[PDB]
Design a protein around this ligand. Structure first.
Ligand SMILES: OC[C@H]1O[C@@H](O[C@H]2[C@H](O)[C@H](O)[C@H](O[C@H]3[C@H](O)[C@H](O)[C@H](O)O[C@@H]3CO)O[C@@H]2CO)[C@@H](O)[C@@H](O)[C@@H]1O
Length: 427
């Protein structure tokens, strides 16, 4: 939907669009970085640097809490109040209904990592702010006070860790952030590569499997089951916060930094935010999610939120926005301050955030089989599980079910399997 016909591979930073005078609006969920008190480089700091190269492209930022729903509402508004947003849970087959293409996916694949993540039909509609993994944020000082001198790598070792933390320390062993739906929905992030070591599990096995959530009796501490059982067991064993209904996200950052929370199950993007939330940065560390597959640990490599451009925006703003995105990708250093993997395609660097990952194999999810690019998304929709789509409510239900002992983890996963397998048959 490119009005200026300028594509991302064609943009020569500091040359292209130097004649443009426009104001563009950047809508994202980093409310922290919209504040003057951000304990790092905030948005204005980046924009000031961008303006040294493009002084006549004014970039303004808007941010919203509960971004996952606000962005969806903003797309329904169908207006010009934004030029760049972080793409929300829009299906691939709908990208071209909202966003401007950055180019052919085969061209963008020479420029960025993950060019086919936010893509459809050979066109790329999203550029990730950085590369992400999911793991566990943990306070190493708390871990030392509890006698834990090596990181758990399996679910049983993880629960034993939580038992030691609760026994020997005052830290909340694992904080759920139940009250944040996105924080609960983030458990979906662990069920593919992390849990199976198989890049083909998410997009090629799950849409052809009626029971992806059942326990794997050949390796019962692997596969999606083991992921969600970890959460179930943390709550049921009494290793989480006393009141799940009153969790608070912003204050949990400080509590992790000061050793009042021992672990939180979050992506790498969360580590600098909590390192910075207090004076004890060096106690806040990042570990692989504790699953091991045949002696090895794996982490899915997938994008953070991707930057998408409004097809409503006029010709000048579309191009200015593409120039800003390219500047964020190639120049800003944002990935390096926000716990990110750089998105420039053949940048092999990585922040110190991954210093416990030296033995971990990062694997990008395989795409769908040729011809089934929509099969997973359709199954997900029919089943209403919303896997990796923001449905945190299904995760909240586990916390409630575990805390109240109304259902076993197996009953819950069987219920998911019924809904998923019915959807699989429908499509
Ligand atoms: O699931 C989509 C996407 O989620 C990414 O993680 C997001 C969170 O979903 C959430 O939006 C979080 O918002 C925070 C923000 O980082 C900061 O802490 C601010 O103060 O508070 C808000 C919550 O109100 O931001 C992270 C990072 O964008 C990430 O897990 C992706 O891999 C994933 O696809």
């Amino acid at each position: 939907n490119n009005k200026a016909g300028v594509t991302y591979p064609e943009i020569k930073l500091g040359e292209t669009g130097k004649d443009l005078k426009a104001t563009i609006t950047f809508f994202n969920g980093r409310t922290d970085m919209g504040l003057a008190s951000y304990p790092g480089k905030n948005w204005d700091a980046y924009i000031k640097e961008f303006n040294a190269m493009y002084p006549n492209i004014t970039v303004k930022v808007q941010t919203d809490s509960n971004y996952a729903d606000s962005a969806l509402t903003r797309l329904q508004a169908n207006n010009d109040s934004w030029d760049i947003m972080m793409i929300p849970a829009v299906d691939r087959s709908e990208f071209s209904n909202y966003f401007v293409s950055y180019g052919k996916t085969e061209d963008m694949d020479k420029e960025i990592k993950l060019a086919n993540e936010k893509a459809y039909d050979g066109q790329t509609y999203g550029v990730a702010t950085d590369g992400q993994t999911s793991g566990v944020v943990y306070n190493a000082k708390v871990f030392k006070e509890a006698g834990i001198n090596e990181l758990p790598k399996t679910p049983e070792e993880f629960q034993a860790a939580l038992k030691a933390i609760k026994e020997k320390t005052k830290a909340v062993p694992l904080y759920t952030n139940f009250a944040e739906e996105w924080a609960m929905g983030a458990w979906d992030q662990y069920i593919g590569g992390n849990a199976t070591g198989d890049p083909k599990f998410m997009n090629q096995i799950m849409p052809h499997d009626k029971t992806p959530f059942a326990k794997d009796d050949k390796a019962p501490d692997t596969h999606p089951y083991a992921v969600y059982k970890t959460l179930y067991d943390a709550v049921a064993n009494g290793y989480t916060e006393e009141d799940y209904s009153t969790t608070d996200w912003e204050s949990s950052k400080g509590k992790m930094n000061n050793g009042e929370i021992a672990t939180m199950v979050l992506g790498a993007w969360a580590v600098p935010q909590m390192k910075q939330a207090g004076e004890h940065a060096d106690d806040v560390q990042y570990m692989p999610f504790p699953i091991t597959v045949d002696g090895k640990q794996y982490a899915t490599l997938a994008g953070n939120y991707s930057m998408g451009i409004n097809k409503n925006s006029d010709k000048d703003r579309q191009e200015a926005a593409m120039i800003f995105v390219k500047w964020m990708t190639e120049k800003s250093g944002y990935s390096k301050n926000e716990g990110g993997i750089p998105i420039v395609k053949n940048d092999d660097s990585y922040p110190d955030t991954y210093e416990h990952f030296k033995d971990v194999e990062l694997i990008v999810d395989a795409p769908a089989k040729e011809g089934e690019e929509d099969l997973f998304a359709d199954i997900n929709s029919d089943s209403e599980l919303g896997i990796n789509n923001g449905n945190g409510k299904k995760i909240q239900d586990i916390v409630v079910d575990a805390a109240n002992k109304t259902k076993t983890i197996d009953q819950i996963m069987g219920e998911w399997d019924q809904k998923w397998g019915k959807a699989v048959e429908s499509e």
